[PDB]
Amino acid sequence: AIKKAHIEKDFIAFCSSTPDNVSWRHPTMGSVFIGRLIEHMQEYAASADVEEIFRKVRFSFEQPDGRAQMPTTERVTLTRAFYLFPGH
């Protein structure tokens, strides 16, 4: 027997800036968003779901400087919390 399923579900996209706007990359230190995401994943994967970690990453960018960017979570169809449970 055939059953219906949602065509699009359980997605989350995380972009380096808001639409129309630039994202920054240090020529020797790497991309600012990538390095900030790694730092936050390393710290918070054990205790927080990915949606929350992405919020924390956005918060870290709150105070603008000469090179400002605001990471954006897009097209979210996660119906549950996604914990990585690192070590398991």
Binding site: D10, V22, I38
Partner: protein, 173 residues
């Protein structure tokens, strides 16, 4: 210790793992037995371009993300300097990989130059555009084109400009 498989990632203890299951009810994504699961991740990073400037420092991003995703339990496929057509093909190939059937989730990472319309391929110029839209990434990994990841989290990470603007406005304190 960072000598283990999880490297620099702080570990979730067995006490923590059960506390999460008590804090929230049956509304967490289930994870598969560590012994049998085959988690996959894909990184597409464009550094060497035909017409647009060289993305110096991209190798630090590849190293960082690759090690991060491995630490979280993902087998990482890294593909470099691809056109939008090559990216599509590579993404289709990733959605057909049989390991997804015995995986509980996936991670997709895109790193390149970008415009408002999407992600720049190898051959991109203003004269002849070479753009992969985010819409296409979702379409290629959805339940129709990737039934193996039905009900499973699909995380997409994009490093790229989304336009020309500095993204700031002035105000007086």
């Amino acid at each position: 210790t960072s000598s283990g498989s999880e490297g620099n990632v702080k570990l979730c203890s067995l006490e923590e793992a059960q506390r999460i299951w008590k804090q929230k009810s049956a509304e967490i994504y289930p994870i598969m037995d560590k012994s049998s699961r085959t988690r996959l991740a894909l990184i597409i990073c464009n550094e060497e371009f035909d017409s647009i400037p060289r993305r110096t420092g991209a190798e630090v991003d590849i190293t960082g993300m690759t090690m991060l995703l491995q630490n979280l339990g993902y087998s990482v496929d890294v593909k470099k300097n691809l056109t939008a057509s090559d990216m599509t093909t590579e993404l289709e190939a990733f959605a057909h990989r049989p390991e997804h059937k015995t995986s509980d989730s996936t991670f997709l990472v895109f790193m390149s130059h970008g415009i408002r319309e999407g992600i720049c391929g190898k051959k991109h110029s203003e004269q002849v555009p070479d753009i992969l839209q985010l819409n296409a990434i979702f379409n290629m990994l959805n339940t129709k084109n990737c039934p193996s990841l039905k009900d499973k989290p699909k995380v997409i990470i994009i490093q790229a400009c989304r336009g020309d603007s500095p993204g700031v406005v002035w105000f007086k304190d």
